[PDB]
Amino acid sequence: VEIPGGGTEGYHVLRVQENSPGHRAGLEPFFDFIVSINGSRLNKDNDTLKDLLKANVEKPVKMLIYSSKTLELRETSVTPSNLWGGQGLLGVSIRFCSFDGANENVWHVLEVESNSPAALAGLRPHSDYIIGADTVMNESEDLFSLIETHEAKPLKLYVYNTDTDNCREVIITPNSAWGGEGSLGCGIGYGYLHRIPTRPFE
């Protein structure tokens, strides 16, 4: 998709508080990137977004969003507010980041062996995709490297599920003694044959 205003940077949505203006606007943690507000392109790490949200309290604002789930842009309206009850005008935590390649660094959960660390953590075969951790991953710093450094230690993973179309935190304790090979006990897919399905809604 062509990005209006060029570039691949924008504000990555990390947390969306329940019942906030952001939640009502449909912002999705992890997959959404705010690209523009009212057509102003947010391609600089500056105060423009903070200041425009304050200027627009109690008024609708049009966001342009890129999703690393659908790989599409969309426009949605949000009303920043001081009246809603929680912290923030939107209720959303963001980080200025690039969305280039963001849909590539996901690990698809395949079969899950009974009584394995994966099964005990609640990983669900075929519908779960591990999309992050509290540390950066990619192909070198990947899932298996991280599981190595966490042998016998709880490890938090952020997991998208296609049946629920949402993300959750899963805590797994890698255990090389579990009985099978490695420390995880499920298959894992990575690459273009194992990406998140791009059309959660028909």
- Domains of the chain, earliest start first: 1-104 (2.30.42.10), 105-202 (2.30.42.10)
Three-state DSSP state, 112 = strand
The tokens of 186 are what? 């499920």
Pairing of strands 128-133, 155-161: antiparallel
- Experimental method of this PDB entry: X-ray
Instruction: Compute the distance between CA of residue 118 and CA of residue 157 in angstroms, rounded to an integer.
Output: 11
- The secondary element (H helix, E strand) that includes residue 72 is none
Beta strands in 6-136 (DSSP E): 9-16, 32-37, 40-41, 61-67, 73-78, 92-98, 107-112, 128-133
The tokens of 121 are what? 């953590």
